[model samples]
Target: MVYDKIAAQGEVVRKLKAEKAPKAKVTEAVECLLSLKAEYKEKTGKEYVPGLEHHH
Candidate 1:
């Protein structure tokens, strides 16, 4: 699960680089995602899972 989160964010980072996005913006986005993952795990006691829409 954690791997998925990391991979997903990594993909975004790659795309940003390819698109020539500002380095600061790309770095900030990655950091934000990392923080989200940490907060999710702290609250749920599990690694964040991606592509799991419609939580129930």
Candidate 2:
């Protein structure tokens, strides 16, 4: 489920208006993506990509 919200999605949403990623699907997924992301930062101190972050 970590990977579920960690994939390359944010940028994918920005360009969506030109592509096909509509708001309907994006919002629900983001609520999960960004929502959990805050949880990650609050404790996990890591993101899901770009070598991310670590150490506790």
Instruction: Using TM-score, give the best candidate's number.
Output: 1
lDDT string, candidate 1, 1-56, tens digits = 24555446645765786799877656755664565555567444344543222122
Q: Write the per-residue lDDT of candidate 2 for residues 1-56, one digit (tens) a residue.
A: 34434445544454563487767655644554555565555334354431222211
Off by over 4 Å in 2: 1-4, 8-18, 42-56
Top candidate (lDDT): 1
The CA lDDT of each predicted structure is 0.54, 0.46
- Number of residue pairs clashing in candidate 2, backbone atoms closer than 3 angstroms, sequence gap of 3 or more or interchain: 0
TM-score of 2: 0.37
lDDT of 2: 0.46
TM-score of each: 0.45, 0.37
Q: How many residue pairs clash in each candidate at the backbone level?
A: 0, 0
Look at candidate 1 and tell me the lDDT of residue 50: 35
